[PDB]
Amino acid sequence: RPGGDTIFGKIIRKEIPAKIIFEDDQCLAFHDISPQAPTHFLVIPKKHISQISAAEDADESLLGHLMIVGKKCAADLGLKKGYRMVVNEGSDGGQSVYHVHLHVLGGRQMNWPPG
Amino acid sequence: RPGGDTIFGKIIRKEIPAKIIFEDDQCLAFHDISPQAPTHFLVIPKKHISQISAAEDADESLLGHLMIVGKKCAADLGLKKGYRMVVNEGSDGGQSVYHVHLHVLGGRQMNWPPG
Numbered sequence: 001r002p003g004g005d006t007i008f009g010k011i012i013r014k015e016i017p018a019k020i021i022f023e024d025d026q027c028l029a030f031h032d033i034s035p036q037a038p039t040h041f042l043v044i045p046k047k048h049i050s051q052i053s054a055a056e057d058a059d060e061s062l063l064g065h066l067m068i069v070g071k072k073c074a075a076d077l078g079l080k081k082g083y084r085m086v087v088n089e090g091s092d093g094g095q096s097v098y099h100v101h102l103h104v105l106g107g108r109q110m111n112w113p114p115g
Numbered sequence: 116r117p118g119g120d121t122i123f124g125k126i127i128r129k130e131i132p133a134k135i136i137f138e139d140d141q142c143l144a145f146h147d148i149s150p151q152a153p154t155h156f157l158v159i160p161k162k163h164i165s166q167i168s169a170a171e172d173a174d175e176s177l178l179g180h181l182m183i184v185g186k187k188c189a190a191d192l193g194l195k196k197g198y199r200m201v202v203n204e205g206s207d208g209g210q211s212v213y214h215v216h217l218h219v220l221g222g223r224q225m226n227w228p229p230g
């Protein structure tokens with residue numbers, strides 16, 4: 001609209017406040033309001049891609065860019081002992097917002113299975 | 116060596132067998148020998164990147180490519196109700212092999228937290 005019609009679109013357009021960590025021309029990172037670890041933030045693309053299953057071949061760089069920004073923000077937030085990155089797709093994956101988002105969690109030992 | 120010096124390097128060079136799903140000029144996907152869901156496979160880059168924290172800006176496309184291949188393989192393996200993609204970094208993240216790898220799990224309801 002630009003930014004999509006989900007709550008993420010409101011965050012991107014600054015219609016509703018968020019604890020934004022970093023922002024560039026392609027994405028934005030902000031803290032998850034329901035953290036599952038001491039540090040839990042999300043990196044979302046400004047381009048609205050509803051689900052990872054709908055991403056096209058041309059979205060390759062953009063998707064890779066979310067992971068680069070994620071590792072940079074994780075280092076900046078002091079997650080030197082490690083972290084886990086997660087992308088949820090659909091019902092079975094637990095996707096709650098239909099705008100592609102990358103979860104980054106750390107600050108504690110992450111267990112296995114990953115859910 | 117090419118392909119790295121971890122077991123992944125042996126798989127890439129076909130020195131040890133694996134249940135390979137797909138392979139292109141940049142990556143390879145194969146089933147995880149210790150599945151945590153009905154469908155659990157990995158997509159690994161042929162270029163040896165030890166950890167996601169060490170990936171450079173130029174590895175952006177390659178990292179994005181692992182996710183595109185992942186969603187394509189997930190659809191091909193019949194994971195139409197969803198899945199979860201996971202990248203583990205370091206001790207806290209549970210990274211067991213020092214070669215960047217993307218986990219794709221589905222075929223069951225994935226829970227939250229993701230570990």
Ligand SMILES: OC[C@H]1O[C@@H](O)[C@H](O)[C@@H]1O
Pocket residue numbers: 032033034042094095096097101
């Ligand atoms: O799945 C989207 C995520 O965004 C956050 O706003 C929620 O807590 C959820 O974890």
Ligand SMILES: OC[C@H]1O[C@@H](O)[C@H](O)[C@@H]1O
Pocket residue numbers: 147148149157209210211212216
């Ligand atoms: O972390 C690397 C993964 O590769 C598989 O070989 C192991 O079971 C493990 O889950």
